[PDB]
Amino acid sequence: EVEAAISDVGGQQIFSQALLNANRRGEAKTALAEVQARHQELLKLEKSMAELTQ
């Protein structure tokens, strides 16, 4: 007559992935992309003070 055939229900697991804040944007965001123009200024101090020391 009868027996077993399909059984369980209460039993499962799940992993979990993750995205990230957008503002993050490219690494260049404050104190990163400005270092290009901040360097020309610093080269200006170096120079103007080279005039100073000479």
Add this chain to the structure above:
Amino acid sequence: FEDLGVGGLDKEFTKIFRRAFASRIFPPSVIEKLGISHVKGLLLYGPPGTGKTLIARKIGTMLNAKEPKIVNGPEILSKYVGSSEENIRNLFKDAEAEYRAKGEESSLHIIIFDELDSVFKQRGGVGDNVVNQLLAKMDGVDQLNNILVIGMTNRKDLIDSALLRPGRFEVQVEIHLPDEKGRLQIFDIQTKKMRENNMMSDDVNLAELAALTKNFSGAEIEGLVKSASSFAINKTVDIAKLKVTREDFLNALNDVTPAFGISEEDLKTCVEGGMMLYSERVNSILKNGARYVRQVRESDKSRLVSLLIHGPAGSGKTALAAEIALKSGFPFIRLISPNELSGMSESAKIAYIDNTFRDAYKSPLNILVIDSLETLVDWVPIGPRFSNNILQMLKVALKRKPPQDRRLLIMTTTSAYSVLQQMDILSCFDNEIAVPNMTNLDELNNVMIESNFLDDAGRVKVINELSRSCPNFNVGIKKTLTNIETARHDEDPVNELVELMTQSA
């Protein structure tokens, strides 16, 4: 008690008030000086649709508790591991919080479970975890005595043994169907908006209405009244005097079908072909049935009777049972036949039958009919084969006396007597009625005049031909009626009716 909207339930409120609230009413100085905790659980049980939700709700308002938090049984389950039980845990959070914060001056909380037996079966799968989770928290290591939990169920005899111990579910209460006084009070409460606002005529006497309605469940009375009012207003469409008179009430009363009442429709269908007394036996049979009905109604000790009717196939057995039933006037009537049960699974059939048995014990007065036995038992002679379990269900059922003063008559029918003795079941039955088929010509005469088969010439000639031809006439009524119709709608009565009728006997 009755100042609030609940009629007929009197003892229950005395008991509940005495046991539950007599320790929350007095000033805490006293009861603290007394040193007793509070009851922390309640189980009230009964048939559906009796007003259990209502009583549960009103209790909270009486105590000025917080708004009730509600949940229903089967929804608790989820299909992930341990969230089915997380939900059970969530419910007590706010009570915990307010207890820790305030202390002993916190305001009482209320929780309502619905259909408790749907999950909380005896333990020993998810089920054990659920039962466990509720136990460990209902009364745990940390004290929490500002809460109250209410339980609602139909089957008390299936809940796990541990929840019913003094400490978790102390007070057990039963809710039964309304009595006559209950019905009268129910009408009084329900028809208050109509009464003061003056849209009920003065002719309607609700006491008569109460008397007329028996085994009405207490919810459906609302259905009746709203239907009647809707009927009246729809009939109107004028704003002279919108009055509801008795005719609306009678109409709506006629329309509605209670759940615990007569199932007229299938019985009328059962006897569709009519009852004509073509011979002398019929009278006697019906007299027997009436006698037994009286014996059931009047006695005290014979609270149950089992009565069997049997005879040859096609003898028209079931119709007599339906007739006897319909001429009795009892409030509760149901019919079990193979027709309903067709297509179901085995477990389904046993469940159905057993439900149908248990319901009757509630009502004061009941008759219950079984259409055929070998068919239900799945008999087939080669081997032979049949289902043992259903047989045992029936065998056990036919001895169970009603649990209380309620009363029951059981009627059953079969055509296979011999098999039943070879089964060793015959001891179930106290008394027997026999239904043989016709063996005479004058009986043919009576039936054919009643059917008005043809004019007298045809009638006389056919009885003469069968007199001279068939000496030992013997058939049941089924073939007689169907053959008569066949001859009628066919040609030349001698050509077929006589020939068929010989070929059948």
Add this chain to the structure above:
Amino acid sequence: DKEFTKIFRRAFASRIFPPSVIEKLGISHVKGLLLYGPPGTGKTLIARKIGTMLNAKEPKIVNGPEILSKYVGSSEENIRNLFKDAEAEYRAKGEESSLHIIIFDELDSVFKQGVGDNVVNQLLAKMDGVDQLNNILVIGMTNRKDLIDSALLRPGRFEVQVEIHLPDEKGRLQIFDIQTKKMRENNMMSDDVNLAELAALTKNFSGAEIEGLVKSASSFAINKTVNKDIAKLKVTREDFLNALNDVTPAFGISEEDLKTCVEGGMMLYSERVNSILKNGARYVRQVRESDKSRLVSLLIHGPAGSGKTALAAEIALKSGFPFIRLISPNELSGMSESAKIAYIDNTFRDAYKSPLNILVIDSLETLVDWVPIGPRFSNNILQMLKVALKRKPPQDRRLLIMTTTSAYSVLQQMDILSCFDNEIAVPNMTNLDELNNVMIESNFLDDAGRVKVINELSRSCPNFNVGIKKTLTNIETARHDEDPVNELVELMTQSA
């Protein structure tokens, strides 16, 4: 139109009355309506049109999957944002507030049995309980009714259920005309195209795939053109007829097999055939005429190969009733037991839904799975049939059932013979004249051959006794080997 009157009379009556009596009495308005049916029926049309017809507010159309929101928790904010206007209008006026209708395309999409759960909680919270908003009416619809969460399925919520339907002749014809308008005006259909017969072709089709058909026939016309004759572009029936092969429906029809069961044709080789046919005609008349005989059962039995199914099918086809179907073992192959029982049950339920009906069951033993060794057989199916055959249909409805069999003695053994009203026997032919009739009807040999066959058989085989099937196949096989008698007579002789 019947739904058009049910919903009007039953549901939508309370709002008509002066609002004062409704507030005073306490009567509560019907709230929820579920339209359900297969895709493509145009349900959104009726849903909009009910609102427009009843002079209701302008609906909010919301898609099913669109309820699922990007942000966690914002779906529920949307659900609560939707009702603000109706709730505020109710606050301002109350009993005089206008009727607000909300239409939910693909309700099942999100309200399945954790955003999709909070939305359930959230709707359920506002829709009943603290609120008594009898102006927020809802009209949901779903193609798949089973996925609805049980939490919502209770009285007072979605109380009225409405069935949708599929195209009729004049409706499909009118939509055909509607689509063809622009082309028929501009003289670019060949006049030979008759629209009505195209409707007669398209039986299980709905408008969008009608457009598919039109575009396809056009595309074939294009194919004819491309390997400056644009003036000759005219869509001809052969484009449309050829295009019929590409598109496909999602329906099924079974009438065809009750037509293929008589593929071999009738030959009327003997008189008893005619007698039987007359009897069947008599019985169908009997059913049609008498108001009391609402259930008639016949049994047809005979030796294997005598020919039993074709006869019943012939009776049924000459009957001409609205509803005819067939149960044969062929359809039931490959399933498990619990599935055969359900299939049979469904078919029986489907036959109670028309004033006059005919039903035919084939070769009972195979349905019961009889084998004589044990003997073994499946009892449950047997008892299913036993109870089914004796059920009087609901009021005013009438059936006529014919069942064919070939093992009468076994049938006698199970004691089921009580279920039938009248029996018919079908013996196979035994006389050589009948062979001659069949033979001339088979026009396989010339006159001389058709005489020599009977001459040879008369002197070899007095008792003929073979089923017609064997005769037909024997003729067929003999036509290739040796057309002369010197094959067929012998082959029949081993078949004698």
Add this chain to the structure above:
Amino acid sequence: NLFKDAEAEYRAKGEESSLHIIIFDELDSVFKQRGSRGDGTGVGDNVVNQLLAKMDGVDQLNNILVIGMTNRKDLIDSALLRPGRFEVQVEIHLPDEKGRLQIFDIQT
């Protein structure tokens, strides 16, 4: 971002627009049936919804043919398989003997 160019050009020029074609090789990667569960981060839903918005309510963009290549039809949302969206489905099965000969011809 893919649809911008053709959109702009079309919007400007009307119907003269040159026909633009886009082909998704290996479509079944991400367009699994949106009415699904597993309840991770819902990006796998948003994506398909986006395409559908740009594909059905095109707002009169009639110069686009999107071609999908797959090995297994079944995986895909039925909500892409409907009129107005992926109408024609072409099955390409094993070659015959004559085609076998042409394949030799071309390879050799």
Add this chain to the structure above:
Amino acid sequence: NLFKDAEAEYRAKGEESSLHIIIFDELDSVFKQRGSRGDGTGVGDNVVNQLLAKMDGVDQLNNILVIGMTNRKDLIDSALLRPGRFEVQVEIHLPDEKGRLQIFDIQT
């Protein structure tokens, strides 16, 4: 996470640490005989075995007291009742008469 505070004190103040007490209520729901039931996903074994490893592992503790309460002694896993883990087992059973008298005394 139940043990962190305990170990933390042990490492710093070696012997003098105060006693930490942790109470398990209903031990018999999660810690069954490992391997018998059909786990399906394989969670229960992990719970049991994690507890085994921590209770008396390669790193010694001398601070902790753990309590367990249950109705069905027999179902608990076999290895946990080894002395050194759950050493002393006590039976609570229905009181006789003198017990009942004492209960009445101390209640009222």
